[PDB]
Amino acid sequence: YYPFVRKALFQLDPERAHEFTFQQLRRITGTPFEALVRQKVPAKPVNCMGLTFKNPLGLAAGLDKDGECIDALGAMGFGSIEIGTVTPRPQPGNDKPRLFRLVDAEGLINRMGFNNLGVDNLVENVKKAHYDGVLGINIGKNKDTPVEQGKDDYLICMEKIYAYAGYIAINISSPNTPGLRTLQYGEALDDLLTAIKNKQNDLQAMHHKYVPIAVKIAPDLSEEELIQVADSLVRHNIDGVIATNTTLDRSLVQGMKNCDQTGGLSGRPLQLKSTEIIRRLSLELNGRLPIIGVGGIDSVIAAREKIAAGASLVQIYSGFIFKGPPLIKEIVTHI
Amino acid sequence: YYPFVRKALFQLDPERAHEFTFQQLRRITGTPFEALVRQKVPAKPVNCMGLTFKNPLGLAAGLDKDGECIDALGAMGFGSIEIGTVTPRPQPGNDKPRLFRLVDAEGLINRMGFNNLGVDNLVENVKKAHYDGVLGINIGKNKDTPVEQGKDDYLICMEKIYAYAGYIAINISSPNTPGLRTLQYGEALDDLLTAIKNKQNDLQAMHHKYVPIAVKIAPDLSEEELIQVADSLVRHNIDGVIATNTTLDRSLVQGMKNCDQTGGLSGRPLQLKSTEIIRRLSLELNGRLPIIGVGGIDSVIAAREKIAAGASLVQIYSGFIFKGPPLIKEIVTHI
Numbered sequence: 101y102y103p104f105v106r107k108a109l110f111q112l113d114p115e116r117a118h119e120f121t122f123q124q125l126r127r128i129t130g131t132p133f134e135a136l137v138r139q140k141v142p143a144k145p146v147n148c149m150g151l152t153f154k155n156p157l158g159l160a161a162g163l164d165k166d167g168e169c170i171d172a173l174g175a176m177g178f179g180s181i182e183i184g185t186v187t188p189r190p191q192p193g194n195d196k197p198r199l200f201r202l203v204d205a206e207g208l209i210n211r212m213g214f215n216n217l218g219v220d221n222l223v224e225n226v227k228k229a230h231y232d233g234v235l236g237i238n239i240g241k242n243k244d245t246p247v248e249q250g251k252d253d254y255l256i257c258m259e260k261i262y263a264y265a266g267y268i269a270i271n272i273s274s275p276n277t278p279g280l281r282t283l284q285y286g287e288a289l290d291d292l293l294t295a296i297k298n299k300q301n302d303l304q305a306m307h308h309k310y311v312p313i314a315v316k317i318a319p320d321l322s323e324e325e326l327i328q329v330a331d332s333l334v335r336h337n338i339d340g341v342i343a344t345n346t347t348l349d350r351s352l353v354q355g356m357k358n359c360d361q362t363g364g365l366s367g368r369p370l371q372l373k374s375t376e377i378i379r380r381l382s383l384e385l386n387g388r389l390p391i392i393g394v395g396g397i398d399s400v401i402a403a404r405e406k407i408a409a410g411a412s413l414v415q416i417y418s419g420f421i422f423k424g425p426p427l428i429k430e431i432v433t434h435i
Numbered sequence: 436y437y438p439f440v441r442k443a444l445f446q447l448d449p450e451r452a453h454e455f456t457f458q459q460l461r462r463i464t465g466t467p468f469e470a471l472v473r474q475k476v477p478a479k480p481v482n483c484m485g486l487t488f489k490n491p492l493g494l495a496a497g498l499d500k501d502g503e504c505i506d507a508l509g510a511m512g513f514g515s516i517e518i519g520t521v522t523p524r525p526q527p528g529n530d531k532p533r534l535f536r537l538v539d540a541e542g543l544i545n546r547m548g549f550n551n552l553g554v555d556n557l558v559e560n561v562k563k564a565h566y567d568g569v570l571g572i573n574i575g576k577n578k579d580t581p582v583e584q585g586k587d588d589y590l591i592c593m594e595k596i597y598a599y600a601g602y603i604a605i606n607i608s609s610p611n612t613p614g615l616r617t618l619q620y621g622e623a624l625d626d627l628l629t630a631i632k633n634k635q636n637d638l639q640a641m642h643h644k645y646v647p648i649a650v651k652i653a654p655d656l657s658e659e660e661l662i663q664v665a666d667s668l669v670r671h672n673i674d675g676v677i678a679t680n681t682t683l684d685r686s687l688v689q690g691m692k693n694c695d696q697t698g699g700l701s702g703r704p705l706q707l708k709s710t711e712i713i714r715r716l717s718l719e720l721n722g723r724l725p726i727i728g729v730g731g732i733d734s735v736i737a738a739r740e741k742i743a744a745g746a747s748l749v750q751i752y753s754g755f756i757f758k759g760p761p762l763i764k765e766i767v768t769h770i
């Protein structure tokens with residue numbers, strides 16, 4: 101019964117709670133105790149980006165940044181698992197504390213800084229996984245890499261993960277790496293999308309398989325910024341768009357503890373804004389490429405609203421923390 | 436702890452559950468036995484419609500249709516309580532079964548037909564109350580009254596309740612009295628508002644009392660229809676608008692039990708639509724009169740989302756059933 105577990109884990113700070121939870125998941129992955137987290141969810145396959153997903157609910161990136169719990173998290177019913185974000189070289193990320201709960205808002209604020217162990221380590225973790233669903237691999241730029249040379253970091257990771265990823269996610273939407281969000285704008289985006297698609301085409305020739313690429317945008321794009329982003333994604337033949345990442349907005353959490361903490365806001369305070377972006381994004385795209393909707397999905401209806409907005413799949417992070425594995429079964433069963 | 440109270444309660448038919456819970460609330464309302472349901476909530480006064488509201492959260496109309504349990508419900512923490520809808524003459528409403536619970540959608544479908552005991556009985560009940568919040572009295576048209584002479588039902592009700600109401604709510608948005616929603620459109624609304632505004636002027640000189648009037652609209656109005664409603668309300672100097680009532684939409688509940696049932700939908704499947712209506716209404720109204728936001732509110736952020744769309748107050752109903760009294764404490768405390 102999750103609410104009791106939640107009350108217990110919430111006595112820890114959010115990052116220590118995750119570290120404690122991942123300790124348990126590692127200690128049961130492969131064990132006859134691994135069934136302790138297995139969940140029977142109805143099958144609901146969906147074809148998206150040429151891939152066939154178990155069901156339309158995936159685990160958003162940022163929970164398993166290094167991909168060390170794919171099997172246990174996959175047993176919970178997720179139709180897909182997105183690991184990352186990972187960078188070429190490992191890096192520590194921002195200083196702690198860098199993660200904060202807004203319990204009354206059922207939201208989180210984070211300035212992690214791409215804390216990860218590097219792409220090579222992720223590949224080794226992936227090689228040991230048995231997940232039968234779709235594996236997304238989310239890559240980003242190292243902090244020290246210059247913004248205008250950020251493409252290189254994605255291309256490096258793409259080469260190491262192509263043979264192992266079900267699909268690849270391009271993170272240019274974090275608020276916590278300096279200048280990463282400028283890669284969403286004008287020439288920077290076109291320059292980047294070009295480099296990525298040419299690398300994709302060269303890796304298809306080398307590995308004799310097409311791995312789709314989806315770009316993860318931010319929810320703080322203006323209407324004109326979003327139209328340009330959509331257009332650029334169609335012109336470069338990107339296979340998907342993940343909308344959205346966390347928000348700089350605080351207008352809905354004013355007066356609550358940790359509302360002035362720098363970083364990106366997620367959970368319920370992001371739901372509405374995320375949904376509106378997907379709807380505007382869907383209208384621009386006009387079905388030319390699919391949308392993976394994410395942001396504050398904490399219920400069957402909330403997930404259906406994202407589908408109505410124009411999304412083909414959905415992801416969850418904060419609602420899995422605040423409402424637990426039951427929310428997985430809810431969404432898969434009734435979406 | 437509500438989730439366990441709800442499991443039991445939900446074993447009963449929606450309307451049987453109301454009868455049983457209200458039988459209990461009737462034997463404790465106005466008596467020291469309402470310590471059983473009392474909740475301490477902080478003071479959060481809001482000025483709206485020339486009145487002072489204890490706190491921004493109110494109980495939407497339709498739960499205490501006859502005004503039997505004002506004190507008990509007030510003890511639960513509501514800053515305002517809207518009783519009704521009540522008609523001039525009693526009427527049984529539509530045939531049972533007329534109330535259906537979704538549950539996976541945390542929504543409700545109802546076709547009650549204004550089941551009430553008449554305005555005269557309500558005034559007697561209100562006479563016994565001792566509620567220090569704002570009491571709203573919601574009045575509607577008797578079933579058999581010609582839509583053309585619907586105004587007469589409203590004027591009759593107004594005279595009988597003016598002396599006892601904090602504000603009067605004009606329900607012309609129910610989908611379950613045939614042709615009542617046409618009073619939202621064109622000069623039908625223009626005629627109704629002229630009569631109501633004139634009765635209000637009279638009743639204020641008669642009773643030496645200021646009583647604002649608010650019109651409760653439907654969520655299924657078209658853009659053009661909403662612009663005309665907004666314009667009509669400003670022109671006729673109506674003091675406020677309650678947006679919104681239940682919806683005929685079912686796009687979000689497809690595939691769920693009772694989704695094809697006839698009537699109005701409420702709860703989570705109405706939250707988004709209700710917020711959009713409020714946003715566009717507020718844009719039209721441009722602060723010339725306040726909005727009471729209602730529709731699928733089941734969280735502090737959902738309540739704040741309606742505040743952000745333009746509402747000055749908020750009401751809950753379906754959320755009260757699915758989340759319980761804790762929602763009152765949550766919303767008043769953090770809104």
Ligand SMILES: Cc1cc2nc3c(=O)[nH]c(=O)nc-3n(C[C@H](O)[C@H](O)[C@H](O)COP(=O)(O)O)c2cc1C
Nearest residue numbers: 160161162184185210345366367395396416417418
């Ligand atoms: C602690 C934390 C870490 C995250 N890390 C990543 C990440 O590494 N890469 C990424 O693309 N998104 C990351 N996200 C964003 C989520 O994947 C998700 O898109 C966002 O939080 C909105 O979804 P939600 O409201 O369901 O949480 C992170 C979010 C949180 C709270």
Ligand SMILES: Cc1cc2nc3c(=O)[nH]c(=O)nc-3n(C[C@H](O)[C@H](O)[C@H](O)COP(=O)(O)O)c2cc1C
Nearest residue numbers: 495496497519520545606680701702730731752753
């Ligand atoms: C069973 C039921 C009875 C209702 N009765 C009335 C009513 O008598 N008068 C009225 O104006 N609204 C009535 N409503 C509408 C609600 O007060 C409210 O406006 C609507 O359900 C949206 O609020 P909610 O989604 O938070 O429940 C009723 C709703 C339900 C579910």
Ligand SMILES: Oc1ccc(Nc2cc(Cl)c(O)c(Cl)c2)cc1
Nearest residue numbers: 109110114115117118121122421
């Ligand atoms: O199956 C799971 C694996 C890891 C987590 N991580 C987690 C992450 C955060 Cl921010 C928390 O506050 C808690 Cl209690 C747990 C939660 C569930």
Ligand SMILES: Oc1ccc(Nc2cc(Cl)c(O)c(Cl)c2)cc1
Nearest residue numbers: 444445449452453456457536756
């Ligand atoms: O304090 C209260 C008084 C009456 C109700 N009505 C009610 C209404 C419905 Cl649809 C239910 O499924 C249940 Cl369990 C109760 C709910 C709470």
Ligand SMILES: O=C(O)c1cc(=O)[nH]c(=O)[nH]1
Nearest residue numbers: 212213214274276346364
């Ligand atoms: O700092 C991170 O790791 C991070 C946070 C966030 O919200 N989004 C993202 O892509 N990265």
Ligand SMILES: O=C(O)c1cc(=O)[nH]c(=O)[nH]1
Nearest residue numbers: 547548549609611681699
């Ligand atoms: O029939 C009713 O009581 C009824 C239902 C509804 O959704 N709205 C309303 O005003 N009345």
